[PDB]
């Protein structure tokens, strides 16, 4: 027996372990369907970023409705320290409507406020140097990030020349400097913050700051390459799982937990082991010949991801070098590979492809002509037509009740909606962060081998073009912009300047938009019962005892912000909510 056994350790799975095992008494099992990385150069240097190393095999989507029907890889990590491990290590915080958002549906002590401590307590900024604050324009409010916690983050110590002519071009078009993008606003550009430890420059992944650090507590178990198959019950109440290998040997284990079972296991992956438990939709668990324990609905609806553009560009005139010297100029690929052997300065301290700086907008800094037309159809249509027909109409009232809220920030002119970022290459990104859309993750057999079906369901809700058309058309006012005028961009097939109307550039991003960024959240959400959540405002799975959900699964919706930083907080917050109902 353990204390508390964790499915998944990753960013939730660590963190929530760690605290758990800072009282002697108490026990943890983290079962990780992933092994230990091996410290190789593509998880721990930025520079040579392979995030295709752990990536969870065998996952596709169905049809993508949204976007002409196509297929897409579905990724996600398997790995111990979860997407941490192989993500692009950005580390920010969402802003504070998006927390006081997810306490106005129904959660008492979900609000910025309440979050702030979990912020601070959960990381150690390191500041840059002062000659790249000044040069690079990084600016941050001290006194709103952590010190003393277990994260470790900070900047690259080298920006490439061109992310100069893009921060004045965005500022020329009403992107300003952004103080502290950490202090719960966002609006315009700023420094991407990077969960790098600073002596090594070097990732700071979950599996380091949460496992590694406390490593040397023997009531801290961790088991890699194996996978939580099934939550255990005596009656209503959580009492064990059983594992097998993940490789898929023909052998299962059972395991027990005094206290608690803590679901860990991702947005994919919780409600998998959610619907196999007897845990989710009576139609679909009668489907498939599974006893129903607690009927559900909300599992595995409420998908939501972020969306992601690839604008691709050619220059008669870009300034060297850029990241795509580190591609292109094998020369200069090895003079900074050798440069941050030697003094862990330069190109390789930035995640390859990235670059520095980054730009977020509000739907009215995006639209600043339309926005109050897109709010006005967005409140028109019934929040039902987003959802399948036929949908539970508790996860309909759900929907209707985010819906009220995301409109809420569609109104402030201090919430983000979309991002723009250029690398200083061929491509520029933007992303949807607030999409109305949602998706479906339903397992499609009792074999916990199998894959479960995912279906983001992208650009299934209309309004969601039209903040994404306007995000695009923000990124065409930066590249056009003097600063970036002159070196000389024009973009590239399949766009182009010929691209003029809303209905000529959303028919190419129809074909182009990834539907993920492997930010998959809200699949087991936290809302009342009968708004179709499937978990309490304290992370407890409705109709069983001793079961939480402690990763972004449990999520009402998703941030102004990429997931990361509150993946810890959340977990540093579920630790305290924990060990004061036991007296931990
Ligand atoms: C490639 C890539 C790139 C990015 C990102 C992800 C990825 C994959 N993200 C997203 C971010 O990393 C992600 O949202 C968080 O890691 C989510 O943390 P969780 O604890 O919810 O799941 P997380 O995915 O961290 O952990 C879930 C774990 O559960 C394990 N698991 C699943 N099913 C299991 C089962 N049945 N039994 C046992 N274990 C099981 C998995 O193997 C995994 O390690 C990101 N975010 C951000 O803010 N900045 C960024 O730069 C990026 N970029
Ligand atoms: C990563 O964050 C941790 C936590 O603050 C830092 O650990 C401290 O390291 C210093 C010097 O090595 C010690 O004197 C402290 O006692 C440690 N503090 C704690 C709270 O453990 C580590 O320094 C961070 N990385 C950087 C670059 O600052
Ligand atoms: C997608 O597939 C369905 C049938 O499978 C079809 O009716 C629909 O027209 C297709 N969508 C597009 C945009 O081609
Ligand atoms: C920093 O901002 C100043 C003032 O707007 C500008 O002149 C400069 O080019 C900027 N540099 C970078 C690297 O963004
Ligand atoms: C390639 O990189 C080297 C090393 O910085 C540099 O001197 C050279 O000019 C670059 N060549 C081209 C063609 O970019
Ligand atoms: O390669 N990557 O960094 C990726 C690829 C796909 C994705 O959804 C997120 C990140
Ligand atoms: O700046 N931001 O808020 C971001 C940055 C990256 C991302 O994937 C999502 C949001
Ligand atoms: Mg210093
Ligand atoms: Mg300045
Ligand atoms: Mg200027
Ligand atoms: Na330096």
């Given at each position: 027996?353990?204390?508390?056994?964790?499915?998944?350790?990753?960013?939730?799975?660590?963190?929530?372990?760690?605290?758990?095992?800072?009282?002697?008494?108490?026990?943890?099992?983290?079962?990780?369907?992933?092994p230990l990385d091996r410290g190789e150069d593509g998880i721990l240097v930025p520079g040579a970023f392979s995030p295709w190393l752990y990536f969870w095999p065998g996952l596709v989507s169905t049809p993508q409705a949204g976007l002409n029907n196509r297929t897409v890889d579905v990724i996600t990590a398997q790995v111990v320290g979860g997407g941490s491990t192989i993500n692009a290590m950005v580390y920010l915080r969402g802003d504070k409507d998006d927390y006081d958002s997810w306490g106005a549906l129904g959660n008492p002590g979900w609000s910025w406020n309440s979050m702030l401590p979990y912020f601070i307590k959960?990381?150690?900024?390191?500041?840059?140097?002062?000659?790249?604050?000044?040069?690079?324009?990084?600016?941050?409010?001290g006194s709103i990030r952590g010190r003393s916690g277990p994260v470790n983050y900070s900047y690259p110590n080298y920006f490439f020349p061109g992310s100069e002519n893009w921060w004045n071009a965005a500022n020329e078009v009403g992107l300003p400097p952004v103080k502290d993008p950490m202090a719960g606003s966002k609006q315009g550009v700023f420094w991407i913050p990077?969960?790098?430890?600073?002596?090594?420059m070097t990732r700071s992944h979950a599996r380091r700051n949460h496992y590694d650090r406390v490593s040397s507590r023997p009531n801290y178990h961790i088991l890699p390459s194996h996978l939580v198959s099934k939550i255990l019950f005596?009656?209503?109440?959580?009492?064990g799982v059983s594992y097998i290998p993940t490789s898929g040997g023909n052998t299962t284990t059972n395991v027990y937990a005094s206290k608690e079972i803590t679901l860990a296991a991702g947005g994919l992956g919780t409600p998998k082991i959610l619907q196999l438990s007897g845990i989710?939709?009576?139609?679909?668990?009668?489907?498939?010949?599974?006893?129903?324990?607690?009927?559900?609905?909300?599992?595995?609806?409420?998908?939501?991801?972020?969306?992601?553009?690839?604008?691709?560009?050619?220059?008669?005139?870009?300034?060297?070098?850029?990241?795509?010297?580190?591609?292109?100029?094998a020369t200069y690929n090895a003079e900074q590979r050798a440069l941050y052997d030697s003094s862990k300065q330069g190109a390789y301290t930035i995640v390859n492809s990235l670059s520095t700086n980054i730009g977020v907008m509000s739907l009215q800094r995006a639209a600043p002509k339309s926005y109050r037309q897109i709010i006005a159809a967005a409140r028109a249509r019934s929040a039902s037509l987003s959802l399948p027909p036929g949908t539970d109409?508790?996860?309909?009232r759900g929907y209707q009740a985010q819906r009220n809220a995301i409109l809420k920030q569609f109104e402030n002119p201090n919430v983000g909606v979309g991002t723009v970022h250029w690398g200083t290459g061929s491509s520029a990104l933007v992303y949807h962060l607030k999409p109305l859309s949602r998706g479906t993750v339903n397992i499609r057999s009792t074999n916990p081998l199998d894959a479960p079906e995912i279906d983001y369901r992208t650009g299934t809700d209309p309004i969601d073009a039209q903040v994404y058309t306007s995000l695009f058309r923000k990124n065409?006012?930066?590249?056009?912009?003097?600063?970036?005028?002159?070196?000389?961009?024009?973009?590239?097939?399949?766009?182009?300047?010929?691209?003029?109307?809303?209905?000529?550039?959303?028919?190419?991003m129809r074909e182009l938009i990834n539907p993920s960024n492997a930010h998959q959240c809200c699949t087991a959400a936290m809302m009342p019962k009968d708004m179709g959540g499937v978990v309490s405002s304290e992370q407890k799975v409705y109709g069983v005892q001793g079961l939480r959900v402690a990763d972004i699964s449990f999520w009402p919706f998703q941030l102004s912000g990429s997931p990361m930083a509150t993946a810890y907080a959340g977990a540093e917050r579920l630790a305290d909510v924990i060990k004061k109902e036991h007296r931990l």
């Open positions: 027996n353990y204390t508390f056994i964790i499915a998944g350790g990753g960013i939730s799975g660590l963190t929530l372990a760690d605290r758990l095992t800072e009282d002697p008494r108490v026990t943890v099992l983290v079962i990780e369907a992933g959960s990381e150690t900024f390191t500041p840059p140097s002062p000659e790249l604050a000044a040069a690079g324009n990084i600016t941050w409010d990077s969960a790098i430890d600073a002596r090594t005596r009656g209503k109440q959580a009492i989710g939709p009576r139609k679909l668990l009668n489907e498939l010949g599974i006893p129903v324990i607690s009927d559900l609905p909300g599992v595995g609806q409420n998908l939501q991801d972020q969306p992601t553009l690839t604008i691709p560009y050619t220059f008669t005139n870009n300034v060297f070098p850029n990241t795509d010297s580190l591609t292109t100029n109409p508790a996860v309909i065409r006012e930066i590249f056009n912009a003097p600063s970036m005028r002159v070196l000389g961009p024009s973009e590239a097939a399949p766009f182009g300047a010929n691209l003029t109307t809303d209905e000529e550039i959303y028919a190419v």
